[PDB]
Paper text:
Our hypothesis posits distinct regulatory mechanisms: BcmE employs steric hindrance, BcmC relies on inherent reactivity, while BcmG utilizes a directing group to control C–H hydroxylation.
Two water molecules mediate the hydrogen interactions between carbonyl groups of DKP and residues R111 and D275. The 5-methyl group of the DKP ring is oriented towards the iron center, suggesting that hydrogen abstraction is likely to occur preferentially at the C-5a position. This observation is consistent with the activity of SsBcmET307A. We found the steric hindrance of T307 could bring C-7 closer to the iron center. As expected, the dominant active conformations for hydroxylation in the F273A, T307L and T307A systems are C-6, C-2’ and C-5a (shown in the dotted rectangle: 49/5000, 90/5000 and 14/5000), respectively, which is consistent with our mutagenesis results and structures, particularly the crystal structure of SsBcmET307A•FeII•αKG•1.
Residue numbers in the entry: 6 to 312
């Protein structure tokens, strides 16, 4: 396959406590959307963020995470009965049509997921879908800002991003509940499959694996964490400034009785799943692989799933 990239040895995932002091945090560049575009605080911040593959972006004022935070804390629970909050529960029993969508009980990971692409956001409380709309819209603006910063000619963008820069593509809100009762890794070490991931988290536990070094990626109040995905990496790997999709994963979280579990949620921006994966070679975006086969490949690596 033309999109494999070179092998990455994945170490066992450390426990939360031992990781907390052993692996110091990456220093992330800060940025915000202002004047209608992504702007970094520091003059070389954009270049450093593309090289780092992680950075921070201010939560835009029109995006209030509150409803998403509440949904993330409850979606995995059984309905209580006679309880208004049940509107935010029971989603392990909610079917969502489409590949890679719906509820997932990951056998070998702490997390269980509820994944909903934008065309299916009516299955969510409207106020929760509204958070996904703000995060995904931010993610598209960031993607536009990246491709402009790379000076990639705009005539290519809609094709090579499978519609994302035209606000189409596969835009997926993803809720994670880390089941602290499971004595395994929080997640597998993985690359995200797509272009730009916007991550809402408040707790430590995310690690970056970079050329055999483990470093923490710590959230910052009032900001999202942003990283890049394998589709952007493959697109740019032969260019003079390649963009890195970092390998990352969540520690085996540790919670005593009564301590709330870790949660997080993201918007993944993937190419349209009927499209093609491209790589710039000799100025031209070369078609390498269908997005369908690429997705199956990348999802197959990101989880240890016998089905
Ligand atoms: C690849 C693994 C990571 C955690 C995440 N999981 C998914 O299922 C989607 C699949 C995409 C093709 C819609 N993308 C992602 O980045
Ligand atoms: O929970 C986190 O900090 C990261 C989650 C993540 O990597 C993912 O959802 O793909
Ligand atoms: Fe991820």
């Amino acid at each position: 396959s033309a999109t494999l990239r070179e092998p990455v040895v994945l170490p066992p995932m450390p426990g939360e406590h031992e990781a907390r002091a052993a692996y110091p945090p990456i220093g992330l560049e800060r940025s915000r959307v202002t004047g209608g575009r992504l702007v970094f605080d520091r003059d070389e911040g954009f270049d450093r963020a593309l090289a780092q593959g992680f950075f921070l972006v201010r939560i835009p004022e029109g995006t209030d995470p509150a409803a998403g935070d509440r949904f993330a804390a409850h979606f995995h629970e059984e309905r209580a009965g006679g309880d208004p909050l049940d509107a935010y529960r029971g989603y392990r029993h909610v079917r969502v049509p489409g590949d890679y969508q719906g509820y997932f009980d990951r056998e070998h990971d702490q997390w269980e997921n509820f994944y909903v692409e934008r065309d299916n956001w009516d299955v969510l409380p409207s106020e929760v879908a509204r958070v996904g709309r703000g995060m995904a819209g931010l993610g598209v603006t960031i993607l536009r800002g990246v491709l402009e910063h790379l000076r990639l000619p705009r005539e290519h963008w809609a094709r090579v991003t499978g519609g994302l820069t035209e606000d189409r593509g596969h835009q997926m809100l993803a809720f994670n509940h880390f089941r602290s009762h499971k004595g395994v890794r929080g997640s597998k070490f993985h690359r995200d499959s797509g272009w730009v991931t916007v991550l809402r988290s408040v707790d430590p536990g995310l690690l970056a694996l970079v050329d055999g070094r483990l470093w923490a990626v710590d959230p910052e109040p009032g900001h999202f964490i942003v990283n890049f995905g394998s589709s952007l990496e493959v697109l740019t790997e032969r260019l003079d400034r390649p963009v890195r999709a970092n390998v990352h994963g969540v520690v085996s979280t540790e919670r005593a009785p009564g301590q709330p579990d870790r949660t997080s949620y993201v918007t993944f921006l993937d190419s349209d799943l009927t499209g093609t994966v491209y790589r710039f070679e000799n100025g031209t975006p070369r078609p390498l692989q269908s997005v369908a086969e690429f997705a199956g490949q990348e999802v197959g690596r990101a989880y240890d799933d016998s089905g």
